Amino acid sequence: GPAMRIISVNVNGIQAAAERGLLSWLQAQNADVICLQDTRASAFDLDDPSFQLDGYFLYACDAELPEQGGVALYSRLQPKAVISGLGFETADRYGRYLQADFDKVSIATLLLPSGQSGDESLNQKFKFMDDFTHYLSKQRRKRREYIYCGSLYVAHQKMDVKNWRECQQMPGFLAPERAWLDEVFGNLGYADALREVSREGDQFSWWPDSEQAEMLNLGWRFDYQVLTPGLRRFVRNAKLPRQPRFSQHAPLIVDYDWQLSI
Amino acid sequence: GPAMRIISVNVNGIQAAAERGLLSWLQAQNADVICLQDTRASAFDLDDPSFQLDGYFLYACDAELPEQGGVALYSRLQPKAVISGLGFETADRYGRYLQADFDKVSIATLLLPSGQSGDESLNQKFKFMDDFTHYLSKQRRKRREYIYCGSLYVAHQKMDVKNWRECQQMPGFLAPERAWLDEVFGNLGYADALREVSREGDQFSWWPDSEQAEMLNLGWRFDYQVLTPGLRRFVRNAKLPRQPRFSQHAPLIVDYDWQLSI
Amino acid sequence: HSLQDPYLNTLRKERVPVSIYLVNGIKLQGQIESFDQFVILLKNTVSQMVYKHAISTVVPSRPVR
Amino acid sequence: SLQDPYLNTLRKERVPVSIYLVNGIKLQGQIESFDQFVILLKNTVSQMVYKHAISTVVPSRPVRL
Amino acid sequence: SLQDPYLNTLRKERVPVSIYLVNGIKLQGQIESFDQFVILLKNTVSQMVYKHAISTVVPSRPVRLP
Amino acid sequence: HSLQDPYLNTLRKERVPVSIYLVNGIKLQGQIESFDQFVILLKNTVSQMVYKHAISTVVPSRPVRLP
Amino acid sequence: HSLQDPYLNTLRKERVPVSIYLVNGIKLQGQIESFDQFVILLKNTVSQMVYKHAISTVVPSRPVRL
Amino acid sequence: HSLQDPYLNTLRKERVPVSIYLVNGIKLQGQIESFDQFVILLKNTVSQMVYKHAISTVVPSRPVRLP
Amino acid sequence: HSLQDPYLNTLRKERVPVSIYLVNGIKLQGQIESFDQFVILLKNTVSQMVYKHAISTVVPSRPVRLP
Amino acid sequence: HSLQDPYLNTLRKERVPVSIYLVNGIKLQGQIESFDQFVILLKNTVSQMVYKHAISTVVPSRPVRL
Amino acid sequence: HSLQDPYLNTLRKERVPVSIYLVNGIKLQGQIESFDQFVILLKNTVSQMVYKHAISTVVPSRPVR
Amino acid sequence: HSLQDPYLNTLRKERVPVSIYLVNGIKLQGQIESFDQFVILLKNTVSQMVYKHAISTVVPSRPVRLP
Amino acid sequence: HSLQDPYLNTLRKERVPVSIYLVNGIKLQGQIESFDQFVILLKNTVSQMVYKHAISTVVPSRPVRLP
Amino acid sequence: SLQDPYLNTLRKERVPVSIYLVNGIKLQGQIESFDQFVILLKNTVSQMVYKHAISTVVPSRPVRL
RNA sequence: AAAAAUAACAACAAGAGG
RNA sequence: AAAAAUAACAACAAGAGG
């Protein structure tokens, strides 16, 4: 039947990931839409032919200061529209959102501040979370399906973290942070594309740069593909490849039964 | 691809509709689940071989007084479960609800009091509407998709009843009644299987017994198949044939792009 | 045994459609075919056995006895 | 023992009680009879609750032995 | 008792059954053996399931015990 | 049943505001009128009757010693 | 009874700080001071009594010999 | 006990890594050191005494069988 | 319209990415290629013409000033 | 009308499949067969007459440049 | 002007049933009996005068011209 | 103007009650008492002034003739 | 402007509180300072300018005559 | 006329006005420019608002002519 | 980034964005 | 009518029904 592959890898800089083999890897995956979060580059830097994958259209939303954000998107088919930004400041001038509008579905890509540097990052993280909650409250009236390929930097449940009793205070597993995912996935009806097929544990996606954590698999699951509820049943195969990763994050490869059209 | 067809018809008595040829019609439609509202017969009356369609399993929920309600269901595949009633007595002792639990979907069939006889039926109708709203508020936490084949006896929109300015005061187009469908389809996110595909006017499911209403097409839409939101996109086509008829109501026929399993 | 056995047998031979609740809140519904000291098997569409240590409550739909 | 005099005292003069199950489901009604294993409570229907799934039994009116 | 003959009829006929535990988790397989206390089933590997933690044992095919 | 009846009897003689936790995490304060092989009574505005197979833990709010 | 009774006793007399897991997932932690057939007396700031039918596992902090 | 004890003995002697699923869904993976008729002891980094009445399933990683 | 076209011409020659709100609430985010007295062509991925009687407002993404 | 008329003549003479979005949001797919100062003749099955004062946008399916 | 006036006259003379879709999506089906600039008279059981600046589309039911 | 003004004059001097429809769907009812090039005066219990650029249709209650 | 501006001047001289319904279907109450062929001023607590192409209807709160 | 001196007095005083569009969308900010067909408003970025989509223009403070 | 279209809400002091 | 399974909420006065 029809199929649609989406990869939502977070790169922590597209230059430092492209030196490690990102673009030679993404070509051999046969994805329809690739969503790149935290690209750490301006719009002129992605205009070079070093990043232009053949067969894919590249669209990017950069930050004003390009080290603080940036979001990229490769697409097999040309979209009906490309919309940058959400409408508020922390999403707009930091370049943490891009949207590719297609025929019936529209595939979005979303970056969040980690909140792991300082308290001002956690404060603008809570600002972004409240404003994006107000955005999701408004977007449920429309007649279009969304795929938010987000790097939320927030883990949902005890299954998504290793040794949750020691991880209660670090940013990424906070109680107002996990209550936000209990609000988005629970009451707002939105689905997780990884939880609809595999409820297996020990499927982590983020690891710190210390080798002792990755050799003992002390991981995190930060990046999601949040689905509008009409998409719940279209999910076939959602996996997180642990070994061929190119950053602190892991790619998220989700195969759907949808047929992507213009 | 995969297909499923669901036919829901309010028969106004299965004996008086079977004398009009209903069972000879339903055999030549290749439906998977046929849902019959206000069947007006006990459980012993549907145990006779006069109503047993070949190839279909018949399950019925009768009232204690068989003239006041009754619900029937024919199924191609045998369900995992058959559940009669939904918890409150105005459908329990009046027999206005049956459910066929299949593999990943449950197809339900629902009858309502019309509120067209007197004011006590209208108060019973408001009681049923509030209790079924409390039921739909509780059923939002489950992972099972529902299709409710509902003889709702309410017309949702100005498109759904012929001349709406003269219809404002009749039971079937009341403002607390249409506000209930505005709350079910709008804020609880449920679909209408007709309006997911066709939004042209002059589709109606019920007419008065007067022939002037028949020939001018002074009809109303009182029949729906109401879908949990994950089913919004599993709707190929939906139709309301005027011509073959067995009741004050036309059949509602819907085709789904979905594959019914045990 | 002085109450459980004349109750399940009365629901069995009269074939009252009963609703059996489990200890995890799952509501099953059907007719009781027979019962041991330890099990009750019910038929809705498919006959299935349910151990009595998982049964919280047996509720008939219509009044019995 | 304690259970056999207390439930007899509770059923002979018919206190409307609330039985809390092990999962948190509460049940209003009055006890009619009880064996070694089950309790038959009845508000509007003859209901049978297994005692291995009962957390607490709370009377609404104060009772003494 | 029908505790033992029903499980013997599911075992000897090799009926693929579904066992629902006391927390809703189902296990599909084929009952290889059983004593008073355990039930061993094999879908992929052999597996011992305790009888105090199951809730329902349903067969895929309609089987009435002799 | 070798050591648990001196513990509950020590709670019964000198009456302690005992907190009993249920198997589903429900906390219940009160005072023990008496206990049985299978069941324990509790004193409050209403007098609770709680079976032992649903009781997870029994703790006193006051540190009591066991002779 | 032939193997849990030496294990609880060698958790008792060496006063190993144990973590005891209830069947609903509640992690209690303290010291084992006494145990009959039916309960285990967990010693902490308050000395509480834990029924054995509500206990999933009893883990030690340090690995001990048996 | 006539059929679970040679099964758990086979799980001991061939030293296969087992996984015990509890009655609340929690997987405890390790290998069985010794079992009573009331408890099982599993070793991964410390020796756990898991009670037999809190266990739903005991499933090994590789397929083995008793003679 | 002596003041309407130092503005659209500045957004055309500097190629500022703009956002055009229509009178029915539809937001079209794009980039002006050319303009008449009556229409404006924008280029997001494909060039489209937009009639000015349907346009409610035109905002730029970054602040700009007139010659 | 320096770009009003040549763009529509280029869409007309090349007879491209075009999509007109009206002022209320209605999407009309067809082909421009003729156009005056006031009207545009879309056509797919039975042709149309579409007034320009209710047209919001006109989107060609293929890339069209003057 | 030069193209809507030969079109509405062709709709008027052969008397084809037209459908006039207004700005707000509301359609009016009937026949065109007469027209000049700024109005179109739609004929039905009663005849109505529709202003031409409140019309989105005018589509006939039969392919003509 | 060659056919609009005799129609409104015929609806005026025969005093036919009209149901006049606005462009947002609002049905007003009254009867036509006066009209210029730009507005129409709809007489009822209050004398309004409806604007012709807000009017979609003008519907008489009874079928009337045109000269 | 043969018949509109006498009606509006009749509304202006007598200082009658009028209600202007816009094309959005919303109402605005108050008197009228002045007008032209494009806008109308309104006296609530705020002094508004209302464009005449967005005005649907103009009604008085009580009937005024027009000579 | 009347629009030009009103908008000139409202521009030179720099009143933080509110413009309500025909669909009900409220815009905040003072007025930089206007010619015949369009108005440039400003609070943070220079917004170009067409006059045929404006319903009302409301000053925040009382304005004299 | 838009319901091939609500035979029509005597009328939402106004959804910084339908 | 039931998440092939939350290496585990020092603990929901208690979802007439998880």
Numbering used by the authors:
A (entry chain B), B (entry chain A): -2 to 259
C (entry chain K), K (entry chain C): 5 to 69
D (entry chain J), N (entry chain F): 6 to 70
E (entry chain L): 6 to 71
F (entry chain I), H (entry chain M), I (entry chain H), L (entry chain D), M (entry chain E): 5 to 71
G (entry chain N), J (entry chain G): 5 to 70
The authors write:
The Crc protein is a member of the EEP family (Exonuclease/Endonuclease/Phosphatase), but the absence of key catalytic residues in the active site cleft indicate that Crc has lost enzymatic function. Crc and Hfq act together to translationally repress mRNA target genes. To gain insight into how P. aeruginosa Hfq cooperates with Crc in translational repression of amiE, we determined the structure of the complex they form on the Hfq binding motif of the CCR-controlled amiE mRNA using cryo-electron microscopy (cryoEM).
In the core complex (with 2:2:2 stoichiometric composition of Hfq:Crc:RNA), two Hfq hexamers sandwich the RNA and Crc, with each Hfq interacting with one amiE6ARN RNA and two Crc components. The assembly has C2 symmetry, with the molecular twofold axis passing through the interface of the two Crc molecules. The Crc protomers form contacts mainly with the backbone phosphate groups and exposed ribose rings of the RNA. The dimer interface of the Crc pair is the largest protein-protein interface in the 2:2:2-complex and has a buried area of 766 Å2, which typically corresponds to a moderate intermolecular affinity. The key dimerization interface is maintained by salt bridges between Arg229-Arg230 of one Crc monomer and Glu142 of the second Crc monomer, which is further stabilised by pi-stacking of the Phe231-Phe231 rings across the twofold axis. The 2:2:2 complex is therefore likely to be the minimal complex formed when all components are present and must be constructed in an ‘all or nothing’ manner, somewhat like a binary switch.
